[PDB]
Curated annotation (Swiss-Prot), chains A, D:
The lineage of its organism: Bacteria, Pseudomonadati, Pseudomonadota, Betaproteobacteria, Burkholderiales. Pfam families: LigB. This is 2-aminophenol 1,6-dioxygenase subunit alpha. Pathway: Xenobiotic degradation; nitrobenzene degradation; Xenobiotic degradation; 4-chloronitrobenzene degradation. The gene is cnbCa. It comes from the Bacteria. Gene3D superfamilies: LigB-like. Not active on 4-methylcatechol, 4-chlorocatechol, 2,4-dihydroxybenzoate, o-nitrophenol, p-nitrophenol or 4-nitrocatechol. Component of the 2-aminophenol 1,6-dioxygenase (APD) complex that catalyzes the ring fission of 2-aminophenol to produce 2-aminomuconic semialdehyde. CnbCa may have a role in the stability of the complex. The complex is also active on other substrates such as 2-amino-5-chlorophenol (68% activity), protocatechuate (33% activity) and catechol (5% activity).
From Swiss-Prot, chain B:
Changing residue 13 to A: Loss of enzyme activity. Complete loss of activity in the presence of Ni(2+), Co(2+), Cd(2+), Zn(2+) and hydrogen peroxide, however activity with hydrogen peroxide partially restored upon addition of excess ascorbate. Partially inhibited by Fe(2+), Mg(2+), Ca(2+), Mn(2+), Cu(2+) and also by EDTA, at 2 mM concentration. Total activity inhibited in the presence of catechol or 4-nitrocatechol but completely restored after removal of catechol and addition of 2 mM Fe(2+) and 5 mM ascorbate. This is 2-aminophenol 1,6-dioxygenase subunit beta. It comes from Comamonas testosteroni (Pseudomonas testosteroni). It holds the Pfam family LigB. SUPFAM superfamilies: LigB-like (SSF53213). It catalyses: 2-aminophenol + O2 = 2-aminomuconate 6-semialdehyde; 2-amino-5-chlorophenol + O2 = 2-amino-5-chloromuconate 6-semialdehyde. The lineage of its organism: Bacteria, Pseudomonadati, Pseudomonadota, Betaproteobacteria, Burkholderiales. Belongs to the LigB/MhpB extradiol dioxygenase family. Keywords: Aromatic hydrocarbons catabolism, Dioxygenase, Iron, Metal-binding, Oxidoreductase, Plasmid.
Length: 270, 304, 302, 270
């Protein structure tokens, strides 16, 4: 079912101010992933973002067309994020229905003005996804869901795609190292805040490249905590869950800073 | 001219309260609901109306910033605020005015006091649902200029103590900004008490038969803390605030409460309770410290 | 010597609120509970504390009488009041004084206006828990004398309509007694609103996580009815009182509310709500009609 | 183990003012029934009174010894009702436990000053029961309990008693037709309110004498509605359930008025 897998950063800095070389490098890398996404001719893009938060039942984007202008509540000074995003209502609605069958209460979200998060918007803009050609099925980051449940959520959404005869591209949107800077910095001297976070970033990235799924599994929770990894690395869990728990390897298209945090573009070889 | 902190309100932001009120600005329609809490706000509403303030300052847990403490810095802001968790209850068209001058004074005092502060200068910025809800609830007229302050990460990213001291400094700084500009300001701590909640949504949200405390322990903490404020034991509430947070999952962790009280110099003064109620099991009290009545409101003369 | 109804309170009698308080008179001891409703009464309490009335008149659903309308008629009454249904929350040692003279005057005016009335002259009579609970809730000092009024069968044995009719007569008969005696009187209607309830007791009764409205519809009835009272639409609440009774199983069927408003000449006046809350699913509002502030309190000459 | 069964009135009028010939006869009939109960040599008296009200769960009196002075809230002018009622704590408690085992939530009520009803008190006084020789197991009249449940409630109490090898006397305490006068009468002029209440009272009593359990069983609901029978005649169901729906006949030792209401003293022939 899955024909593409990607982990793109959820930070808007790469899109917003790409003249900053570190951020520009990440922008091009995400753009490249978008080409690779397109190349695989998926009918839908299975999206999970770390910034798209839910605290009750699980949320699935079910609005046919969401359009507007988002301003990031942290990074408003760097520009605006205009968005025009299609959802596969048929698939997304089927995910809402399948979720309780898999022990997770879920609802659709179809409201004009609904706050689609930064990560989904930036991934959409940079990747050329969210179009009527590459519509989205966005699953929410439920704060009460663990890595294990996130995987169940992706697997689930992959089965619904199969039921519907649809090729799928999975994108997990979120960061790595979570040590954001607490003061205003000069954008061009932004770097990973710790050498410890950087080691951890390069360590797990290497494990993702090799396809070392087994060693990845036992690294993720220690890494998630020690390197303050964006939402417990569940956006990777999303990928794993979609791929049924195995992948041949990965191509690290980009890696860099986002105000002290770590961001990376990973192209999975299935 | 003199600066004045007229009063601090504990003004929670549960969107269901505005849903139940059925204001024309709110798209979804309700059968009513959360009447107890809505009556508490009515009492708060006319208590504020009588204050005739220059400006309302609000600190919202739903504007989370990493790089210090941000301040609304654009004269006019508007848009449709949709609650991300309850979009079926809160789809609110708003239009507000920012007291840019006061916000900047707050930011400067913040900077002068060792905090990293930030002016929100982007006019397309959507003011958070938390701020919008608290404002409508206590002032549905939208006729008082406002100063929206962000809730800095510190209590969650570092810890409660380091985070709370920053809210303390921010409070002191806010006070100093009020007195230098000479504002007649009202402080709004947009915090919920115990934040344990139902993980399941009810078929019809207005169904008050499905609305009650999520936990006994949580509810008891709320009451222990409320009566404590009502006795005026401000010293004792803040002495308990860390454990209250740890065990009640209190939204006072976000910092609005420590900010407000720091700005009020922690007045050992009896608070007026307008009501307590639960929204999704979540504990919410609408409370007031009336500084003007207590002779603690005037701050000194303003600047030239 | 103009008699006045200073105020009429809607003062429900759920024992749990005395239980939650832990007064010295009530034997069982609680971890608190029902704080919203207890604050509601905290307002009503100080509001009554400012009034300085000669007497409090209570109409209680829990003194049921078949033969007419009974009035407490012995100067002093006391005893241990154990709630039959909630004995583990309410075991209250009480001692009260009866304004026997107003009680008698009430029964006479009642008698003259076509009601059958009786004076309760037995000194070993145990005043009902409904009366005791309301009185403690609104006046825990026990320093105002009282005229305890029974709730006559009428609305149950005959029907809502005819029952409220006798209750209406009792009210104006009461107003008439107050103005003839010259008393400065506060009226207490010991009524719950919607009285649908849970059929099970929570393991620990104070557990407020297990406290909420029994039904949606009943709660909705409660709110609507309290709001019309707040909007001064008194004629409208009474136009709706029969339907409210049937659909919400409202305890105003007992008669106190009508008795009170009939004594207040159904003032088209805004009631102050002190608070609403539920006890065992039951709807309870604590409210006041301040007749003295409205200049409707003075009852006329002689 | 059920050695005798009786229905007595709940009204205190016969005890309080027996100088009223009509009320006086009822008092003697109740006193005679007590003589018949004693001769049956029971170990306990299974008592249900129509005036003992429960609204939540079923209540069983579990206080070893309850004493005090009860004043009826309707009939206070006629005198005081002193009482000293002994309960069989073991049996009552066993009835508490067994009740949920039969789908009826129940509790024991063991409180000093608990308001024991007029029916229980007057039955004890007139019959000579609630003594240590004739202790009581009182089961509340739960207003939400039907005839159905009331029998189920008596049957489990008899079974609990059987279980503790105790000879039971069952007493159903309550009135008949309940058309109480709504103005003060001369007590000496008391009579059944109207002839239709009398016809029903007499008809059903005749049915009780005959032991015609079946004809009675269908007469009861219509009798209750039409004659305004005390608490839907559930004090009778209590007898019926205890005897397990079977009895030979009965001897009505008394029948007369109590302020227009009907009252009877019945001795059941098992
Ligand atoms: Fe919140
Ligand atoms: Fe009641």
């Amino acid at each position: 079912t899955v024909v593409s897998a990607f982990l793109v950063p959820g930070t808007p800095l790469p899109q917003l101010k790409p003249e900053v070389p570190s951020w520009g490098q990440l922008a091009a890398a995400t753009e490249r992933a978008g080409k690779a996404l397109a190349a695989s001719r998926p009918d839908v893009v299975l999206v999970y973002s770390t910034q798209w938060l839910a605290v009750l039942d699980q949320q699935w984007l079910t609005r046919p067309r969401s359009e507007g202008v988002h301003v990031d509540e942290n990074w408003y000074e760097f520009g605006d994020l205009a968005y025009d995003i299609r959802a596969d209502t048929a698939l997304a609605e089927a995910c809402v229905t399948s979720s309780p069958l898999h022990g997770v209460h879920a609802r659709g979200v179809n409201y004009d003005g609904f706050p689609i998060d930064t990560g989904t918007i930036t991934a959409c803009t940079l990747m050329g996804i969210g179009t009527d050609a590459f519509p989205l099925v966005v699953g929410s980051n439920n704060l009460y869901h663990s890595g294990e449940i996130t995987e169940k959520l992706a697997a689930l959404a992959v089965d619904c795609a199969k039921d519907q005869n649809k090729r799928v591209a999975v994108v997990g949107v979120g960061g790595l190292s979570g040590s954001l800077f607490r003061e205003e910095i000069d954008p061009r001297e932004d770097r990973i805040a710790n050498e410890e976070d950087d080691k951890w970033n390069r360590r797990v990235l290497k494990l993702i490249e090799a396809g070392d799924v087994s060693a990845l599994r036992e690294a993720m929770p220690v890494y998630a905590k020690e390197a303050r990894v964006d939402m417990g690395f569940k956006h990777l869990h999303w990928i794993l869950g979609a791929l049924k728990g195995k992948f041949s390897g990965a191509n690290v298209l980009g890696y860099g800073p986002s105000y002290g945090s770590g961001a990376a573009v990973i192209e999975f070889r299935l | 001219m003199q600066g004045e902190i007229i009063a601090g309100f504990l003004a929670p932001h549960p969107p269901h309260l505005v849903y139940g009120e059925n204001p024309p600005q709110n798209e979804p329609r309700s059968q009513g609901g959360w009447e107890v809490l809505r009556w508490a706000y009515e009492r708060a509403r006319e208590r504020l109306d009588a204050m005739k303030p220059d400006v309302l300052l609000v600190h919202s847990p739903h504007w989370i910033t990493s790089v210090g403490h941000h301040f609304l810095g654009v004269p006019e802001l508007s848009g449709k605020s949709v609650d991300p968790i309850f979009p079926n209850v809160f789809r609110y068209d708003f239009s507000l005015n920012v007291d840019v001058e006061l916000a900047e004074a707050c930011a400067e005092e913040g900077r002068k006091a060792g905090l990293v502060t930030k002016m929100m200068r982007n006019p397309k910025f959507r003011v958070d649902y938390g701020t919008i809800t608290t404002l409508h609830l206590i002032r549905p007229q939208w006729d008082i200029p406002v100063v929206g302050i962000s809730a800095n990460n510190s209590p969650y990213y570092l810890n409660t103590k380091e985070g709370m001291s920053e809210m303390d400094v921010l409070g002191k700084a806010t006070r100093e900004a009020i007195r230098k500009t000479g504002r007649k300001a009202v402080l709004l701590a947009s915090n919920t008490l115990s934040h344990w909640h139902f993980h399941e949504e009810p078929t019809i949200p207005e169904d008050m038969s499905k609305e009650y405390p999520a936990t006994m322990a949580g509810y008891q903490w709320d009451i222990r803390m409320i009566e404590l404020m009502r006795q005026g034991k401000t010293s004792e509430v803040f002495k308990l605030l860390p454990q209250f947070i740890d065990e009640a999952f209190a939204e006072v962790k976000s910092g609005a409460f420590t900010w407000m009280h720091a700005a009020m110099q922690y007045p050992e003064l009896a608070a007026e309770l307008f009501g307590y109620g639960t929204v999704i099991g979540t504990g919410n009290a609408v409370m007031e410290w009336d500084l003007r009545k207590a002779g603690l409101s005037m701050l000194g003369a303003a600047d030239q």
